[PDB]
Design a protein around this nucleic acid. Sequence first.
RNA 1: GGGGGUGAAACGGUCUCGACAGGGGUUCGCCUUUGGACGUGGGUUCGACUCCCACCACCUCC
Length: 122
Amino acid sequence: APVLENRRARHDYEILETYEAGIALKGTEVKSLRAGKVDFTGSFARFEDGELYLENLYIAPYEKGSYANVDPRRKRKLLLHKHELRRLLGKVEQKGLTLVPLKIYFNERGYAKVLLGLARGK
RNA sequence: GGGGGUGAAACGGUCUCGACAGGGGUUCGCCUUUGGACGUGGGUUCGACUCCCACCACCUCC
């Protein structure tokens, strides 16, 4: 169930700020999440248009049996206010920073939320 | 091939804080409201992830 962070990142990049952003999941995705054999090995977030879609996040699809689910590595959108969103973007694509998946979990109100943060390292 | 069990740490009361769409409003700034994620389509409920309903999938029992 709940809280699973990205241990892959600490030794790779370094966080500047950290935002929290609800994600656009489907439902089975959510079940896969309530479990825990998904990985951020390689996953970061990117703005395809003006919206930010965390990508390469693999979420083992209802992998406690076998089921009739979805594309494990699907570009999942991210939610964040217009103001809270116009920022991070301007502090990034200069290719100096990177949107990397920090932690994942469900909030008080029961919603899976992702935690992102600026990055850089070598 | 039949039988049983499983499909959200609160055993009913949503607001995905946010993006994005669909409204109704607007001094075109913006305010307001609805959706969207809990395997799936179904109804039932003032309202449900949690109550029914099949159909699926896992596991399981002659």
